Design a protein around this ligand. Structure first.
Ligand code: HEM
Length: 391
C-alpha cells in the first residue's frame, strides 16, 4: 500500500536510503505501518524533532511497551500472560543506574581492559584468517554479561540466553512460534535460576537487585530477561559493528595508535556513526498533542530511528564521514532523556577497551571486502555472522 511499511530491511551497515528521504520530506513526523502487525505508526528521523519527542513528558515509553499497543515488532517482547514491565516492577519495590554507574566502571574497567588485551594478544599469535566476532567479541561480551549483569554463567547457559535474544529480537527469519518460545524459555529460565544466580558471590546487577515486602520470583525473573534483552545483543552487535568501522578506516586507527588520548573521542564517534538497531525507539502519546506542528492523538505511537538522527546533516556536518575528532552535538546512540541507556558507562568502558586493543596493534585488517561480510538477517540489533581478519 501507499503507506510505508516498517522496518526498511537494512540488515547490514548500509542504512536504508528511505531514512534520508523521509528526513528531507516536508513532514517532521511521517506515518508508516508495521510490516509485522499492520499497526499504524509515526516515524521521526530529524535530530531536532527527536530531541523534542524524547524529552516530552507526554510521550511514554512504558505505554508503548504495554500489551495491545501498536508496535513495530512482530511479537510482543514478553512471555505471554506476563506484565513485561521490569523497570516499573523495580520501582514499586534506581538500582539499575545505581549498579552501572561510574563507581561500577572503576571496579570493572581493569579486568575489562585485561581481557580485551588477552584476547587480542591471542589473535596476534594466529595464522592467516581469524574471526573477530567469534574469538574477540563473543568472549568479551559473555564476560561482561556474567561479571556485571547476571552472575557466573555456564557456557550452555550463556549460549541459551544469547540464542533466546537472537531469536526473539527479530523482525523476520524465524517463525512466530520460535519467537514466543524464545521469550518463554528465557522467562522460565529465570523463574528457576534467578535466585541461585543472585546468590553467588560477586558484583553483578542481578545480585544487587535481589539483595535490597520481599522481591517476588517473577519480578526477579523479569529483571533477568530485561538485562539479557538490554545488554547482550546490543553489546555484541555494537562491538562487532565498531570493529568493522575501525577496520574500514585505517587512517583513523593509525591516528589512535600514535595518540591514545584521542580514543575516548573516537568511542563517541563510533556510537554516532556505527548503526546498531534496525528498528526505532518508541513512545506513546498519553494525551492529544502536537510535535513540530503534527497532531498526534492519545494512544498513538511515534518511533525515533536513532540511526537516522545520528546521520542527520542538520546536526552533523558530513554525517556519513567517520570523523573521530568530531565536535558535534550529543549523539543518540544511547537515546536521550529519561530513558537514556543506564548501561551507557559500562558500554563506553567496553568499547574503549576494544578500540585501545585494536589501536595498539598496527596491521589488523579485514580479510575480504566489506560487501562480502554476511549479516544475520532481521535482527533488531545488527550483527555480522563473522568478521574475517588478518594481520
Ligand atoms: C553498546 C551497547 C549498548 C547500546 C548501544 C545501548 C543503547 C540503548 C538505548 C539507545 C536505549 C534507549 C531505549 C529507549 O529510548 O527506549 C537503552 C536503554 C536501556 N539500556 Fe542500553 N545499550 C547498550 C548496552 C546496555 C547494557 C550493557 C545494559 C546493562 C544493564 C543496558 C541497559 C539498558 C536499559 C535497562 C535500558 C532501558 C532504560 C529505560 O527504559 O528507562 N544497555 N540502551
Amino acid at each position: 500500500t501507499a503507506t510505508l511499511t516498517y522496518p526498511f530491511h537494512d540488515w547490514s551497515q548500509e542504512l536504508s536510503p528511505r531514512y534520508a528521504q523521509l528526513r528531507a520530506s516536508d513532514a517532521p513526523v511521517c506515518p508508516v505501518v508495521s510490516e509485522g502487525t499492520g499497526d499504524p505508526l509515526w516515524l521521526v528521523t530529524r535530530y531536532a524533532t527527536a530531541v523534542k519527542l524524547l524529552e516530552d513528558s507526554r510521550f511514554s515509553s512504558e505505554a508503548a511497551q504495554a500489551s495491545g499497543a501498536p508496535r513495530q515488532e512482530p511479537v510482543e517482547l514478553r512471555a505471554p500472560g506476563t506484565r513485561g514491565d521490569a523497570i516499573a516492577m523495580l520501582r514499586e519495590a534506581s538500582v539499575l543506574a545505581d549498579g552501572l554507574g561510574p563507581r561500577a566502571v572503576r571496579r570493572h574497567q581493569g579486568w575489562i581492559n585485561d581481557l580485551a588485551e588477552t584476547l587480542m594478544s591471542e589473535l596476534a599469535s594466529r595464522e592467516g584468517t581469524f574471526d573477530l566476532a567469534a574469538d574477540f567479541v563473543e568472549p568479551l561480551s559473555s564476560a561482561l554479561v556474567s561479571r556485571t549483569l547476571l552472575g557466573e554463567l555456564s557456557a550452555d547457559e550463556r549460549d541459551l540466553l544469547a540464542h533466546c535474544a537472537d531469536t526473539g529480537l527479530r523482525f523476520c527469519g524465524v517463525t512466530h512460534e520460535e519467537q514466543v518460545h524464545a521469550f518463554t524459555q528465557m522467562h522460565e529460565f529465570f523463574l528457576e535460576h534467578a535466585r541461585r544466580l543472585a546468590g553467588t558471590p560477586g558484583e553483578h546487577l542481578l545480585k544487587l537487585i535481589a539483595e535490597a515486602g520481599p522481591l517476588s520470583d517473577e519480578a526477579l525473573a523479569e529483571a533477568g530477561s530485561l538485562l539479557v534483552v538490554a545488554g547482550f545483543p546490543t553489546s555484541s552487535g555494537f562491538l562487532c559493528g565498531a570493529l568493522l568501522t575501525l577496520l574500514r578506516h585505517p587512517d583513523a586507527v593509525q591516528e589512535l595508535h600514535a595518540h591514545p588520548e584521542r580514543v575516548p573521542s573516537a568511542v563517541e564517534e563510533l556510537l554516532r556513526y556505527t548503526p546498531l538497531s534496525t528498528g526505532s525507539v518508541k513512545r506513546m502519546a498519553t494525551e492529544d498533542l502536537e510535535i513540530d506542528g503534527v497532531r498526534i492523538k492519545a494512544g498513538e505511537v511515534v518511533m525515533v530511528s536513532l540511526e537516522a538522527v545520528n546521520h542527520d546533516p542538520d546536526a552533523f556536518e558530513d554525517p556519513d564521514v567517520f570523523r573521530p575528532g568530531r565536535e558535534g552535538p550529543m549523539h543518540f546512540g544511547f537515546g536521550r532523556g529519561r530513558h537514556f541507556c543506564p548501561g551507557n558507562r559500562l558500554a563506553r568502558c567496553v568499547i574503549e577497551a576494544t578500540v585501545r586493543a585494536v589501536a595498539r596493534r598496527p596491521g589488523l585488517r579485514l580479510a575480504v571486502a566489506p560487501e562480502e561480510i554476511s549479516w544475520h538477517e532481521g535482527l533488531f540489533f545488527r550483527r555480522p555472522r563473522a568478521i574475517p581478519a588478518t594481520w
